[PDB]
Amino acid sequence: SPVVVEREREEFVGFFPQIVRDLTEDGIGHPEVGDAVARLKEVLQYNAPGGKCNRGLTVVAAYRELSGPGQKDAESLRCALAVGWCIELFQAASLVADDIMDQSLTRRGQLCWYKKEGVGLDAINDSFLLESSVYRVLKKYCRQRPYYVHLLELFLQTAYQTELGQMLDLITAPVSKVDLSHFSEERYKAIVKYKTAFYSFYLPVAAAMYMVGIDSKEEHENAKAILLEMGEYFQIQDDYLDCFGDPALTGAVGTDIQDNKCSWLVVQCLQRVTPEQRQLLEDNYGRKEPEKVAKVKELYEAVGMRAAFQQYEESSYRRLQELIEKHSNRLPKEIFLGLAQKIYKRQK
Amino acid sequence: SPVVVEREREEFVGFFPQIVRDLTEDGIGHPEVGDAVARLKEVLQYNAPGGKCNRGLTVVAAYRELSGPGQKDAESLRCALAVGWCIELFQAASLVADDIMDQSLTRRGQLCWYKKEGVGLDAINDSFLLESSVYRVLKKYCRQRPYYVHLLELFLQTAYQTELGQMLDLITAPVSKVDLSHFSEERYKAIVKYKTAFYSFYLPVAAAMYMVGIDSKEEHENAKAILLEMGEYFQIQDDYLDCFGDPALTGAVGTDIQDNKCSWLVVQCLQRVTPEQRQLLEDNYGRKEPEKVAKVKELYEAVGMRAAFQQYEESSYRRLQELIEKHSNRLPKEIFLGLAQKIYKRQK
Ligand code: DMA
Ligand code: DMA
Ligand SMILES: [Mg+2]
Ligand SMILES: [Mg+2]
Numbered sequence: 001s002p003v004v005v006e007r008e009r010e011e012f013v014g015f016f017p018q019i020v021r022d023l024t025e026d027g028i029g030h031p032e033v034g035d036a037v038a039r040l041k042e043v044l045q046y047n048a049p050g051g052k053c054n055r056g057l058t059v060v061a062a063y064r065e066l067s068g069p070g071q072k073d074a075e076s077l078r079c080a081l082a083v084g085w086c087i088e089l090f091q092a093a094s095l096v097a098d099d100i101m102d103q104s105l106t107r108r109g110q111l112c113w114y115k116k117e118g119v120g121l122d123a124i125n126d127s128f129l130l131e132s133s134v135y136r137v138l139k140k141y142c143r144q145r146p147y148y149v150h151l152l153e154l155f156l157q158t159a160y161q162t163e164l165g166q167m168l169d170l171i172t173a174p175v176s177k178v179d180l181s182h183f184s185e186e187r188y189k190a191i192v193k194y195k196t197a198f199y200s201f202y203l204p205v206a207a208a209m210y211m212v213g214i215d216s217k218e219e220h221e222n223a224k225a226i227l228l229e230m231g232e233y234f235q236i237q238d239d240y241l242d243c244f245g246d247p248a249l250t251g252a253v254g255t256d257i258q259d260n261k262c263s264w265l266v267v268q269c270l271q272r273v274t275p276e277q278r279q280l281l282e283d284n285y286g287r288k289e290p291e292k293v294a295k296v297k298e299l300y301e302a303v304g305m306r307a308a309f310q311q312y313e314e315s316s317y318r319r320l321q322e323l324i325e326k327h328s329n330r331l332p333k334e335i336f337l338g339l340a341q342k343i344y345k346r347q348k
Numbered sequence: 349s350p351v352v353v354e355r356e357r358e359e360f361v362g363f364f365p366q367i368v369r370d371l372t373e374d375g376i377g378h379p380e381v382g383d384a385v386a387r388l389k390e391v392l393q394y395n396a397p398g399g400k401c402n403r404g405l406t407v408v409a410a411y412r413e414l415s416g417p418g419q420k421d422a423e424s425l426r427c428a429l430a431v432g433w434c435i436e437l438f439q440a441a442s443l444v445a446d447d448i449m450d451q452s453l454t455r456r457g458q459l460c461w462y463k464k465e466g467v468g469l470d471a472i473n474d475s476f477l478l479e480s481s482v483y484r485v486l487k488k489y490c491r492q493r494p495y496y497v498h499l500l501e502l503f504l505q506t507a508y509q510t511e512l513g514q515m516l517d518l519i520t521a522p523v524s525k526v527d528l529s530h531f532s533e534e535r536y537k538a539i540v541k542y543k544t545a546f547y548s549f550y551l552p553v554a555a556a557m558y559m560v561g562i563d564s565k566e567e568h569e570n571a572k573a574i575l576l577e578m579g580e581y582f583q584i585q586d587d588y589l590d591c592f593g594d595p596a597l598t599g600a601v602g603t604d605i606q607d608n609k610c611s612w613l614v615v616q617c618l619q620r621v622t623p624e625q626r627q628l629l630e631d632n633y634g635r636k637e638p639e640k641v642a643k644v645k646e647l648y649e650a651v652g653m654r655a656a657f658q659q660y661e662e663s664s665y666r667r668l669q670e671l672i673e674k675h676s677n678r679l680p681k682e683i684f685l686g687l688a689q690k691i692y693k694r695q696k
């Protein structure tokens with residue numbers, strides 16, 4: 001619902017300054033580090049805000065859907081928000097770095113933080129600081145809470161798992177050398193499972209779970225299960241949308257197969273190819289030349305990725321409900337649906 | 349004592365493979381991330397080993413000096429080692445990054461990890477992974493221990509405080525632009541307090557403290573106090589040794605005032621200077637030209653940094669004992685002395 005969803009969004013966004021203050025207020029005057037904390041302020045402000053927040057928001061709504069009447073106090077609510085922004089801070093820490101390693105130029109419609117004159121490789125330390133920030137926020141709101149340790153362990157683990165997924169990326173698709181040798185189906189799936197699924201989907205729910213008291217490992221597996229299908233489909237979708245979508249396209253309806261990106265289409269292609277066609281891709285791909293690009297895509301419609309998607313979004317749903325069945329015994333299915341209704345959308 | 353000190357050292361070093369195994373054993377076969385964890389192995393092995401280990405060792409000896417007869421079991425001892433290697437892992441995470449941001453070439457006599465062909469900016473993610481490693485080790489050995497949270501909070505905080513000290517460095521002495529404008533006495537002192545003191549001296553003792561049960565904040569301040577004088581003197585010393593030391597000089601008796609390094613001598617200089625002399629430094633400094641370098645140093649002996657040091661190491665000791673007096677009420681002074689006997693040395 002428009003009214004609720006947005007009322008939720010307005011509170012989240014309206015919450016950012018607070019976090020900013022939390023992180024720097026008493027630091028800005030510090031006769032020793034004041035210059036430093038003052039610079040931090042800028043980093044937060046340049047990088048943390050500006051996404052959609054559907055990640056951070058997920059904690060909130062979940063908590064909302066999980067807590068009991070006793071746990072909807074203002075205090076409890078603020079934490080949920082606070083823990084929400086944490087996921088936001090963490091991902092920013094991530095992205096800032098994805099940017100230096102990719103020699104990217106743009107992000108969220110602003111220039112990469114590293115590209116700002118006067119910054120440079122320094123951003124390397126800046127993302128370390130954005131990552132630190134996450135734990136400073138937790139210490140701040142949840143330190144005197146039974147679930148403190150769980151949440152600490154949970155963020156630290158996800159951090160490692162994404163770094164691994166990242167690591168795999170960095171190794172598979174080196175952005176200065178084409179090699180489609182390693183663009184496999186399981187590598188793509190493995191890169192996706194780690195680099196984003198964990199932190200994009202599991203993390204916000206798991207957080208809310210531990211905050212209501214569900215600390216049961218095997219209840220974490222039932223979530224992890226459904227949630228992992230979810231974020232996988234999601235990555236795929238972003239993947240499809242990038243090339244074949246448009247009407248109402250969420251910001252930058254630009255694109256980037258110029259970057260030898262291990263995307264689903266490429267992979268789904270190389271399985272549908274002939275040996276000529278493979279060397280076709282093998283050449284023209286990862287190329288910032290309008291001509292090659294057109295060819296690349298020709299190839300995709302030439303191979304018919306279009307229906308491959310419709311048939312995939314196809315099974316993807318179905319499967320999910322079944323998974324909703326096997327794994328939402330104790331948890332409120334409501335969760336995974338609302339999440340789903342904002343994730344499955346379409347675009348043919 | 350040679351015999352003890354070294355017996356302690358041999359166990360520490362002999363402990364590394366274990367950590368390595370801890371970190372990768374069950375990961376190396378993983379059909380999804382195996383390529384990644386296999387690469388991790390290399391990162392650990394290239395970067396973590398090779399220092400002196402006096403940092404990690406400090407936890408051990410302290411624990412040894414603090415525990416009671418009940419707490420010297422093998423198990424307890426392994427943790428101390430394990431927590432020791434953690435400080436080692438963390439600093440490595442640090443250095444690997446100090447290297448990319450400084451465009452350095454060498455480290456611990458090997459080439460910077462980032463300079464290895466095939467690596468590059470990727471190391472940015474590698475140090476993230478070295479940092480993750482620290483918490484994986486803690487989860488492994490101290491998860492079922494009363495002091496788990498304290499140690500988790502302690503490493504996370506230090507991480508932030510050094511990053512700040514780093515941040516200050518990065519801003520004060522930008523390695524591609526001389527500017528001695530900001531080389532002040534308090535900036536140097538502030539950079540030193542944060543970038544190294546905290547993690548080099550306070551951290552290993554504080555860790556041992558919490559492991560024996562001293563979780564008292566104000567007992568952490570009494571340590572912090574003495575310890576901070578310590579690591580400050582230490583940085584200074586490294587600083588002096590770099591330029592004016594030699595006979596038996598610990599590895600690379602090379603040097604680096606070619607890098608516009610905010611070192612103590614520079615600062616101590618700019619306070620002893622004339623306005624001519626200042627522009628002298630202002631020019632020749634941060635220069636990889638044998639001629640300038642000689643001038644630079646001429647200046648230092650020209651100004652007489654030599655005795656300024658002897659007079660500083662001078663007060664530095666004294667002060668310490670006094671601090672040992674005001675602050676080792678409840679803790680065993682033995683600690684800070686042994687630490688001191690390996691730190692104060694001299695070299696005129
Ligand atoms: C969450 C994370 C590590 C994203 C990096 O992905 P990417 O290198 O494929 O680039 P982009 O910023 O376009 O996703
Ligand atoms: C512990 C830490 C962040 C060291 C970086 O110091 P540096 O940039 O002054 O260079 P070096 O490696 O010579 O100390
Ligand atoms: Mg990128
Ligand atoms: Mg990338």
Ligand SMILES: [Mg+2]
Binds near residue numbers: 446447
């Ligand atoms: Mg350096």
Ligand SMILES: [Mg+2]
Binds near residue numbers: 446450517518
């Ligand atoms: Mg530096």
